[PDB]
Amino acid sequence: MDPKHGNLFADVPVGAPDEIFQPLLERKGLKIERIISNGQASPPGFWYDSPQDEWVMVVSGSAGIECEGDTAPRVMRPGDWLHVPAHCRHRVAWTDGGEPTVWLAVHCDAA
Amino acid sequence: MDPKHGNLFADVPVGAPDEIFQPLLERKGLKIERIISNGQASPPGFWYDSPQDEWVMVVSGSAGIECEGDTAPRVMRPGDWLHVPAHCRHRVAWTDGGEPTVWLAVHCDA
């Protein structure tokens, strides 16, 4: 009923040892969330693989992401986004080593 | 099938007379889009009223959004987001008069 609001750069832990996820909106078949990285990368051997599509953007900091079948990871600065269709595998090659990397991620039906 | 990528700061038409909307992802009951404003505001007496929820954020620039009942516009700067539930009436009171306002909006089911 009532509108909620926030700021994506507020209450961001600097130096947390592991990535943090916080949902912003949850509806049937839909999730919008903030991700806070502090220099972590996907562990060796690890690939994400989801039955939902993902749309993800770097809002602050920086990163590299590799999609399977690509020749190399892709540089992602603030404003760069990526659509990962369901079942397309991907990994985080790196995140910024000097500051938090804040992302906005949307998970939704492949439909 | 294959992944796509882009940059929200690429191909920004500065000073376009009207607001520009461009979908980044469309699925059943879902639309992610980029919006570019260049100082435009909702016309007098206009209110949006959608059967969908909207989640919207200012990525660059600034704006004021006024939800029905608000005593003043909510000032939004980079990183600020707002969830507008389905059928909550709202309008854009102003957008930055000095630079483009780049928004990311998500429309989904209530």
In whole angstroms, give the CA distance from residue A42 to residue A62: 15
The dihedrals phi and psi of A98, each to the nearest 5 degrees, come to: -115, -15
Chain A contact present for B12, CB below 8 A: no
In whole angstroms, give the CA distance from residue B40 to residue B35: 12
- Alpha-carbon radius of gyration of chain B: 14
Residue B109 to residue A30, Cβ atoms within 8 A:
yes
Residue A64 is which amino acid?
G
In whole angstroms, give the CA distance from residue B66 to residue B103: 16
Which residues of chain B make contact with A106, given a CB cutoff of 8 A? 25, 32, 106
The two structure tokens encoding residue A102: 């804040």
Confirm if A59 and A84 have CB atoms less than 8 A apart.
Answer: no
3-state secondary structure of B52: coil
Confirm if B107 and B53 have CB atoms less than 8 A apart.
Answer: yes
Angle at B61 between CA B56 and CA B66, to 5 degrees: 50
Spatial neighbors of B88 by CB under 8 A, at least 6 apart, are A1, A3, B49, B67, B68
In whole angstroms, give the CA distance from residue B47 to residue A18: 43
Spatial neighbors of A89 by CB under 8 A, at least 6 apart, are A47, A48, A49, A67, A68
From which experimental method does this structure derive?
X-ray
In the CATH scheme, what is the code of domain A18-111?
2.60.120.10
Which residues of chain B make contact with A10, given a CB cutoff of 8 A? 79
Question: E strands of chain A, at which residues?
Answer: 4-7, 20-27, 30-37, 53-60, 63-67, 74-76, 80-84, 90-95, 101-108
Distances A53 to A38, A105, B20 between C-alpha atoms, Å: 25, 10, 25
Class (C level, CATH) for B18-110: mainly beta
